[PDB]
Amino acid sequence: DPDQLYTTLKNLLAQIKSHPSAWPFMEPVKKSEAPDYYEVIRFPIDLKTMTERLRSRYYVTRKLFVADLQRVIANCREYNPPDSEYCRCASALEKFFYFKLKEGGLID
Numbered sequence: 001d002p003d004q005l006y007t008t009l010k011n012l013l014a015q016i017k018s019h020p021s022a023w024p025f026m027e028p029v030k031k032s033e034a035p036d037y038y039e040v041i042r043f044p045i046d047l048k049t050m051t052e053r054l055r056s057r058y059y060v061t062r063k064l065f066v067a068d069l070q071r072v073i074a075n076c077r078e079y080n081p082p083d084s085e086y087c088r089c090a091s092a093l094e095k096f097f098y099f100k101l102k103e104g105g106l107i108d
């Protein structure tokens, strides 16, 4: 059901982008913020790029969307010190989006 999938993912992404802990993840990391980021992190991802992917019908499966969303968090934990504001935000956003993924029937 492509339309159900699209609208469900759209509605989910809108909620994730509204959460207060989303702020580090809304747009791509700039080289001025982290100069080696694009050498260290080889599949960079952020919520603006996820919005572009959604709208261009990249997310033809639920799993492709979930992979990208989970990678926002994984990249943060790989790049940054484990005790850091960015990792705190990542953990808070993750907690929220797992509540929302469960609410939406997108994971068990």
Ligand SMILES: CN1C[C@H](Nc2nc3cc[nH]c3c(=O)n2C)C[C@H](c2ccc3c(c2)OCCO3)C1
Pocket (backbone or CB within 6 Å): 023, 024, 025, 026, 027, 028, 029, 030, 033, 034, 075, 076, 079, 080, 086
């Ligand atoms: C686009 N860019 C992404 C940055 N994202 C980011 N930068 C770094 C640097 C080292 N590591 C990481 C990392 O993992 N991420 C995700 C966050 C940065 C930002 C800075 C200050 C803010 C803010 C956003 O929004 C509200 C107010 O102040 C914006």
